[PDB]
Write a protein that binds this ligand. Sequence first.
Ligand SMILES: NC(=O)c1ccc[n+]([C@@H]2O[C@H](COP(=O)([O-])OP(=O)(O)OC[C@H]3O[C@@H](n4cnc5c(N)ncnc54)[C@H](OP(=O)(O)O)[C@@H]3O)[C@@H](O)[C@H]2O)c1
Ligand SMILES: Nc1nc(=O)c2nc(CNc3ccc(C(=O)N[C@@H](CCC(=O)O)C(=O)O)cc3)cnc2[nH]1
Ligand SMILES: [Mn+2]
Ligand SMILES: [Mn+2]
Length: 159
Amino acid sequence: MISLIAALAVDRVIGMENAMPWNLPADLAWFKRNTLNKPVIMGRHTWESIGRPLPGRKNIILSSQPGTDDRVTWVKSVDEAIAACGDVPEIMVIGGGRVYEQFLPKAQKLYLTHIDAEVEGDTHFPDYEPDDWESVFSEFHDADAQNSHSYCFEILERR
Ligand SMILES: NC(=O)c1ccc[n+]([C@@H]2O[C@H](COP(=O)([O-])OP(=O)(O)OC[C@H]3O[C@@H](n4cnc5c(N)ncnc54)[C@H](OP(=O)(O)O)[C@@H]3O)[C@@H](O)[C@H]2O)c1
Ligand SMILES: Nc1nc(=O)c2nc(CNc3ccc(C(=O)N[C@@H](CCC(=O)O)C(=O)O)cc3)cnc2[nH]1
Ligand SMILES: [Mn+2]
Ligand SMILES: [Mn+2]
């Protein structure tokens, strides 16, 4: 019952200095629509990148150190993170790079936004095995006044 959601620029770049530079409100909105009312699991750097809880979602932060904010749930292993979600039928893993690597093998579904942008990055989505993933949906959007790049929302399910 595990899904990854991520937005990927050119070469699978997902981040640079604890930021997406990416500003795509339509994508952030897609993210909200696919995560609201589900638990989200993230790594500590992603927690710091976002800088505040995501409302309307149980926020679960992976770290090895004691937690530093009781507005969210802290866990110290992948298995503890899954357990902490409660007994639900969709858990959303929201990154970052190191967390996506761990959860990939388990996960059954990938919500990937392909952004037509070149960013010189320090974090990448895993180089996953494409043969193992069926595209069940793909919608492309051209750039507009609110969104400076074109981008494509797709959902993959394991074959
Ligand atoms: N494009 C996107 O969709 C997207 C999504 C998410 C994030 N990002 C970007 O990705 C970057 C952050 O990713 P990152 O790869 O540097 O870091 P990350 O995966 O967010 O965080 C890694 C940290 O999480 C903790 N952690 C990971 N696995 C753990 C485990 N099994 N057990 C216990 N703790 C564990 C550790 O914290 P401790 O060191 O405290 O132990 C580890 O250093 C930023 O640039 C961010 O903006 C992009
Ligand atoms: N498709 C996708 N896009 C992303 O932007 C994204 N971001 C993360 C991790 N980082 C973030 C960063 C910001 C917000 C955010 O503020 N989103 C709001 C709605 C839009 C907004 O108000 O900015 C939210 O409540 O989720 C969410 C996740 C993980 N997977 C992703 N996946
Ligand atoms: Mn571009
Ligand atoms: Mn397709």
